[PDB]
Design a protein around this ligand. Sequence first.
Ligand SMILES: [Mg+2]
Ligand SMILES: [Mg+2]
Ligand SMILES: [Mg+2]
Ligand SMILES: [Mg+2]
Ligand SMILES: [Mg+2]
Ligand SMILES: [Mg+2]
Ligand SMILES: [Mg+2]
Ligand SMILES: [Mg+2]
Lengths: 444, 443, 443, 444
Amino acid sequence: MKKCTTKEDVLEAVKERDVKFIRTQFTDTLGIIKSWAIPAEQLEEAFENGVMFDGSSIQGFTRIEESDMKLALDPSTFRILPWRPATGAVARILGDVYLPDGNPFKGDPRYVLKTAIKEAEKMGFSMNVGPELEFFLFKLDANGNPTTELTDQGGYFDFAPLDLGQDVRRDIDYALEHMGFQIEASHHEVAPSQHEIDFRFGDVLCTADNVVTFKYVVKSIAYHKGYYASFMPKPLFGVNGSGMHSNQSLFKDGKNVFYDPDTPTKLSQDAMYYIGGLLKHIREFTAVTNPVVNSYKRLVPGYEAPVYISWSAQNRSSLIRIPATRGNGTRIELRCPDPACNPYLAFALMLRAGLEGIKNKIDPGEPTNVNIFHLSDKEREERGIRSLPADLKEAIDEMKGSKFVKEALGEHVFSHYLCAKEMEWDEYKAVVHPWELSRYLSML
Amino acid sequence: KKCTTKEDVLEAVKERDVKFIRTQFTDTLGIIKSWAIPAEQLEEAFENGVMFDGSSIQGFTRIEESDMKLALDPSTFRILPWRPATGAVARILGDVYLPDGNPFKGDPRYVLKTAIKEAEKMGFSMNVGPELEFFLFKLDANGNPTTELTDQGGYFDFAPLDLGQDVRRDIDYALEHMGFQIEASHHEVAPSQHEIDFRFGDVLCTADNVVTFKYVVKSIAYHKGYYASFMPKPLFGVNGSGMHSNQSLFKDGKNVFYDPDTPTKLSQDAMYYIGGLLKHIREFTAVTNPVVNSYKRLVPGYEAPVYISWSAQNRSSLIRIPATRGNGTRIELRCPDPACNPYLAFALMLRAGLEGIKNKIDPGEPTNVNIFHLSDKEREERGIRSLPADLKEAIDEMKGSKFVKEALGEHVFSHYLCAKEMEWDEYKAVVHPWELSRYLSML
Amino acid sequence: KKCTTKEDVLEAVKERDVKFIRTQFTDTLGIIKSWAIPAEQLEEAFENGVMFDGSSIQGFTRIEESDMKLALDPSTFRILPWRPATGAVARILGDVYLPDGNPFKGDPRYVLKTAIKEAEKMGFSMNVGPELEFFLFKLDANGNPTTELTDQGGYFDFAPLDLGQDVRRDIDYALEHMGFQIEASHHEVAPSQHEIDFRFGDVLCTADNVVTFKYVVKSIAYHKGYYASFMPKPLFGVNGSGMHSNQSLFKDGKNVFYDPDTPTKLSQDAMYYIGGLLKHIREFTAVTNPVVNSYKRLVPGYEAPVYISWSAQNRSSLIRIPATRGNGTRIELRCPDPACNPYLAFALMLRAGLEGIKNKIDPGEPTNVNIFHLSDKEREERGIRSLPADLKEAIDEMKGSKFVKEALGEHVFSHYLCAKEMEWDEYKAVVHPWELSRYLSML
Amino acid sequence: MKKCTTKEDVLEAVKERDVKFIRTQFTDTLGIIKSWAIPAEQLEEAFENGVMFDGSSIQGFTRIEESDMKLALDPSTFRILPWRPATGAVARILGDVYLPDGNPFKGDPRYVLKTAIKEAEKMGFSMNVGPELEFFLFKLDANGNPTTELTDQGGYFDFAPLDLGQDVRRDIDYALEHMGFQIEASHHEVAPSQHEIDFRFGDVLCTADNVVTFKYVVKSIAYHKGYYASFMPKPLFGVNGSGMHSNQSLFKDGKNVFYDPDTPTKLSQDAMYYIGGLLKHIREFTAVTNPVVNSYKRLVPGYEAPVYISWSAQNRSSLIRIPATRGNGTRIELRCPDPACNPYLAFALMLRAGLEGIKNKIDPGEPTNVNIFHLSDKEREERGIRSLPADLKEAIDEMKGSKFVKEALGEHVFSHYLCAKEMEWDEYKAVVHPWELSRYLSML
Ligand SMILES: [Mg+2]
Ligand SMILES: [Mg+2]
Ligand SMILES: [Mg+2]
Ligand SMILES: [Mg+2]
Ligand SMILES: [Mg+2]
Ligand SMILES: [Mg+2]
Ligand SMILES: [Mg+2]
Ligand SMILES: [Mg+2]
């Protein structure tokens, strides 16, 4: 590995490491990973004048017309991919999207996260994020297509699988380390064939880039060993779903502003306000953290995924959890998102909501130290404990009337995101599922 | 002939060689319930009633038993339209009584009777002619139901013309054997979809016939190798099956919906009846459209009503006024599907219209445009609301409805809602193959 | 077996034990439509008419209902040629009326009646004998239609001689048993192809029989394990199926087309009648050849005509004069296929021929040369035009035709064109396997 | 039909109805239905001298040696079977088993019920019984063997099935009525393809004979229409099991001794004592009412089968239930037995236990009007609510040390029953089931 800073740094590394193709990396509004290939010979001119490309690719499947846009490559994002083709090495690079008139394109989710970072800098804060990505490892069918066929029957923290799946699982870990991911931990998860990789706790912009890189790197490596890596929230009924727990904290003057040695919980007042802002707005952008119809098959009671809006320091099954670590490691964990979400939009909205809590001094209320799943509607109503949206349609409706989400995302991203999700829901709600035939065909 | 007394039924049992009597009733959710009585016990049954487990009326939300007595109604005795090897079979209905002697208020038939009583207090009787649409599918190798088609015909097509032509004819002839007096039978819009229109008659008699219709058609089709489906929407991309409910009020021989002196020839009370129906239809859509599959039919683009409006010209309105006037003046509510309990559905329709007449509920200007063609902005300008989009929303609308609670009684109200909530919670957690097709390769 | 009054029908229903009556009508596109009436309700139907959804006539382009009334014509009563165990079945036709009492102008049968009415203004009555060609195919294991051959015979061959010999005989017997008075039946050119020639009768009665013929032959074949197909061109490389229409005009009981002293013994009005047919045929080919598959039959090299011409010698001309003279003098239009709506096709043929007599339209000199053997420039000099080469071209020629719009009425005209356009817009986007076989490896 | 009283009655009916073969009917110790065929020509000599047969057939599968025994035919039990072979009519007949020395064989379960009836007559009581027999209707495989393939998917009191299964279901009802069973009701039961037939409330000895006749008549008729009738307690997991609810009451001087118009529940003191005796001894003979290993897959919480020892008048889910009917129809319903039990032994022990309650004035305690399934072990322990045996081994152990069951059954039946059930359990407990492979093969 190495750290590149100038374009001259990257151009040198291309020659000495025989990099033949550079892959751009970005995401559309919905989080789908987008890319195109540039020959390494073209790279020097790309750094000088940028690269024209069809920016309607960022709109998602709701793109109406073409839109010429410029990608200004960022040399510090240049990273060599962990596979070695016989032809030559391959690397990825990120960048900033500009309109023909020279202004940055506000529709790029990466730009949205960057303006959220700028709002934090105005109040003197920088945000660090450590995500915990759960995924499934399935077998491919005889034609190479993904299935939900299990690769092991192990459980939480099991040393599984121990067949050829042990090697692909180890190959995934090795390649992430080969790219400088600095993985914290990787283990088996609760559901069969389910796995977790814990990212290094680091800067939000760099971490968000790594989440996108993580997805296609794991998928490509699993693919080449005969397996499929799934980031579906809930691919299998009756077992755990896959979430993306998002640990986060704010820093100012190189000090963790969530830690206070004097207070009882050893948490500062800013952390309380940050939690309050998260609890105040979480319903309005659940459609961003849980973006697909399948997301709400995971957001059901009984499988470790939080469906009630609360915070606590003791039990994990709360929406917001405080890990025991204090001092510089003080953080709060938001446990609702799933790996289908766009990391740029999800991290940006978490930051904006938390910052909104700090600037308006939003009290988070008492923590709920009991397991809310053991309570009645009356007991929940007595304590005023609200639910997350029960399906994508409800989350869409809560996001449609949120002035907060519109300001944080911008009009272009806001309408394009909602329009795409509405078409997704309208298509889903009309489908006659086999479950309905099994229950009703004989009966009616 | 017509049966009126227990002596009429008993001699008909001797004369037609009836060996088995099947009782007929429904639970809260509309599932048809029955048990078999040997014909020789029929005399004792008329004299003392029949003890049975009334917990069968609860539906699948039953936990404890409850001894109940069925008092047979001799006028409901009817011989079933199939002739077994040894003796004919007949069905009979009755009134369910608690051991203390009071009528059981949880019986859906009793619920319709109280609604009839409410209309009688006002001097009205309700006539109902329902239009029942069903699908005719073939059976698989093991005799199990499928959704595999029997024809590719369309609206009013003379189809099927293969062996399916015979089973369709057999169904029509069986209903006529029972004295149904069908008005029409024809092919519907979707492939393998058929419709049978009932005679316009008294609501209590009609509701009894809808229940009888369902298992009679299913049994006749089964014994010919076919399956009759009353699912609201068994197939994607084609029409669903509804149960349009033409209804009318009569004040001792006169149709109160007719008025020769108004321009539309509809009376004021017909306008109020529509107003009450429109005011409350959201509150009991869970009764007219009771299963999860019901709301795959209530989607835009298939002539099933989605928006709440009335008209005399556009058919795709929630409430349609047919052209016929005079004695045949009626209004047609087009949202219900054949999965609904006809006793509860007709009772709530009657109460809502009666409430409109009592409270002079203006129905507003008719929507003479296709609301489907309009945009969401115009709908708000015209104040056009929608029917519930799924069973959960319909459950929530009914949950806080004083009108529905009073009309059904608190027994049926809670039992019906509890069953539907359990049904929804099971459905909502299922991971469907559609999700795998869309997201397994994408995420 | 001649029915004239409603009392004639009612007595025959009672004597022959008819239990179901089937109405018979067609929609705008020629699909046969029907609904069933129990015979007990037949007497009320004769007195008051039968209310039904008139949008069924509109085709598949319907969105809104329209309540209409069918006034039954007792002279069209006819018992169907199959005998259910329950009882006999009969068909009946009638006229469609709006609720206001006016005849519905959108019924194709009404469109034919107006052409008959305009012909009577000049003292003309039209007789037609249609020659209907169809295919007899096998059913697959599931009873679905296929194009599997039932014989390999040719023109006028005594084939098939296996069990297919019995179904062909059963078809002929069923038609004779129903009073059709078939003239001849024989094997057609293509394998498994068959032709049945109708008696020369009045246009209205003949048109009703063409509709009845189609579902009778269909049902009889189905119940023997075979499929009767009326597709124009179900099989590439062999003859298509046409519906040749021999027609003649009568005035004062004598044949208008016959003239004993003329060289060809053809009258001046016969020449004018052909001229009107030739002048307008391009404008309503979309009616005589209504489906996309119709123009796979209208390709050069087979019996189907693709060039607008007439002759008394060549077969392959669009219009041919049979050698028969006197009372049997007739002209034969050979372009239609059995998919056409007979009411609309016969009406437009009559109107076009009538416009020829009204306007003294000269038909030109006959083309006695096989036009297929000619170059494009040869036909250019002789003014020989061709039929539209696909459905879209036929639609465009009909779209801008004052003659067709007036003869059908603005409602039938609009609805027919809108449905056919939707048809073509679906077909034009399909990627066919032939394209895959030709271009996948090449490009 | 007709009622036969003398041997001359039966012999006449044989000639006029062309009965060609007579089938004896009895049961072994475990309830398996036993029979052998007698030609009708032999019948007259059979009434005169009896029929020698191998009485070790009554011992069950624990028969060690042969034992010559005599069957004295009972003419009043002669009944013509409801099928009509082309060869000739067929009838069944019961009788009494005698040893070569002329004494009745005490090992016949029918004798055991008869001595229980004699104990009731000593105290002036006669017992009436109405059983409710649940059974399943399954499809046969391609070779004609029983399966658990469903014939319908209907539920409680559904009008199902409506295909050819509607005819076999109706054929079963018709044939029972053709034999003079006088069926009270027949309906669909809770589980798919499950059905119930309610017997006429009548004399215990006659009713017990009918239960045995019912089983092979239903099975034979279902068999000849292509179906299988199953009396397994729990053939399918996750749905209801099949029970044999046993309604009963005592009569003296033609009056129902369970009815008292003066008491609050309108139940006499004898009924209270009768319930007390049943509750006192039910554990000791659960092995008789629930005799097979499969019986205790039904005796699990949650599927209408009672697992706790209690009585009540309101909720059915009690072990003993009082129906609402009073006066001459006053009865108590015992809901634990399943149709696998021997009716002679089960009815005899219920009678003996109830009579023991009356003679010792055993108070039944307060009724438990709450659903016991909603209670903790502590709440159940506080009210002293005991459980039924949890498996056949536990029931065997409770029966092995019961002086009451030994006296009521006799030594021969007692040891032979227990020895057979112990061998049944020893064979079962050693089997390695597929469930164990599914759970442990991958894990260990
Ligand atoms: Mg985890
Ligand atoms: Mg965590
Ligand atoms: Mg309809
Ligand atoms: Mg209608
Ligand atoms: Mg020909
Ligand atoms: Mg010809
Ligand atoms: Mg039961
Ligand atoms: Mg019971």
